[PDB]
Amino acid sequence: ENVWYSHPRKFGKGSRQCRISGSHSGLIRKYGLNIDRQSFREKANDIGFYKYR
Amino acid sequence: KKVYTTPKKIRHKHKKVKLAVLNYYKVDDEGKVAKLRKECPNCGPGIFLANHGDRFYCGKCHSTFATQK
Amino acid sequence: MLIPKEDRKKIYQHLFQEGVLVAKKDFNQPKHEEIDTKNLFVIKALQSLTSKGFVKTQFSWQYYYYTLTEEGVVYLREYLNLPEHIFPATYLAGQS
Amino acid sequence: AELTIEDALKVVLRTSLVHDGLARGLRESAKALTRGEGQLAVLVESVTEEAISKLVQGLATENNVPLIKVADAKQLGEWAGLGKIDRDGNARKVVGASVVVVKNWGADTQEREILLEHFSQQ
Amino acid sequence: QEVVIHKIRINLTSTKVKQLENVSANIIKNAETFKLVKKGPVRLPTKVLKISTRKTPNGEGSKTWDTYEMRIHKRYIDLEAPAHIVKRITQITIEPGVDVEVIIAA
Lengths: 53, 69, 96, 122, 106
Ligand SMILES: [Mg+2]
Ligand SMILES: [Zn+2]
Hints:
The structure is cut from a larger assembly and holds chains A (about 55 residues), B (about 70 residues), C (about 100 residues), D (about 120 residues) and E (about 110 residues). Chain C is built from three helices and three strands; from the N terminus they run αβαββα. In chain C, strands 1-3-2 form a three-stranded antiparallel β-sheet. In chain C, helix 1 crosses helix 3. Chain C has one domain: Winged helix-like DNA-binding domain superfamily/Winged helix DNA-binding domain (Arc Repressor Mutant, subunit A). By secondary structure, chain C is α+β, with helices and mostly antiparallel strands. The PDB classes it as ribosome. Keywords: ribosome, eEF2.
């Protein structure tokens, strides 16, 4: 309801959130995942990413 | 953690100073009406103006007048 | 909680057509998808519901999920009106 | 006693509250009575300084008169619905219903139209 | 009466290989029954997607890494064939997982 409740957060760390946790630390944006690498590391096998070499 | 600062002065949301039958409009006869101040030009009648020292503003359109009355 | 009551009625109405609601975990958002209110106000409304009976809540992947229970359907009918044989997602519309 | 004691006006206010078509309050009644919305008007008897009673008299007589006596305001508010839950039955915390104006109507025919005809035509 | 050849390209892109190769074999066998002029199952380079990541959450202990990668198998089956025979070969030969897709415009 108040007017000034928002800095321009178009870009950088503060804008780019993750899909899962809502974190600004170790964020995979590669191939547009938008996932903090630790949740990715949990679900990687689910999302098609397998350890081969 | 480190200790908090404590200047002193705190500011709370105003309670507004509510009032009812408040206190515009009149009737002399009984049947007909005699409106005080004026109604809004922009929106329909029923909404009234705010009378100050040569400055007006409405409520339904937050604060949008300029001309005197 | 301090909601202009017109915006709240729209959210209830929009809830009852769907029988379902997919809200983000995104406060400070100017307007919600589909409904013409802030996302935060929809989440406050669906927070207010969950407490007094109703409304089965999840919080996975920054998306809240709210389905209306049997008593949830009864109270949304009480708020709006619509008496009986109505939309939600308890039963199908025709053949789908 | 099968005949209604002005209980075909309260039934309009219930259906109006149910279908979302009530203009309760002092100003909403005036906005309802100006343009094509407010069809039936409801003004309080027990009014201090005679101000709010005299206003709706004028709003009624401005174009189309839709007014009636009303039973002391508090009874209409209890009859329509002013209180969430209120235990199993009754036990609603008393509220003065203020000035009210009916929008939409919704329900058709019945005793409500009979009371409107007798008060209008004279 | 028509016999209007639009020249249609089929897109097969997927992770799994043994499904994809079986799907690709099924379409050419349908082309052999319907007897059409077609270029065979062309095989484009496999875009391997490499997400490099430290194994840890905390960033403490030894500095280990996991190349979480994704295989992709991009294939083509170009048809010199009409619109109606393509509508048939889209309806049948559908397996789960493999992304069947049609370009249709030469
Ligand atoms: Mg401090
Ligand atoms: Zn204005």
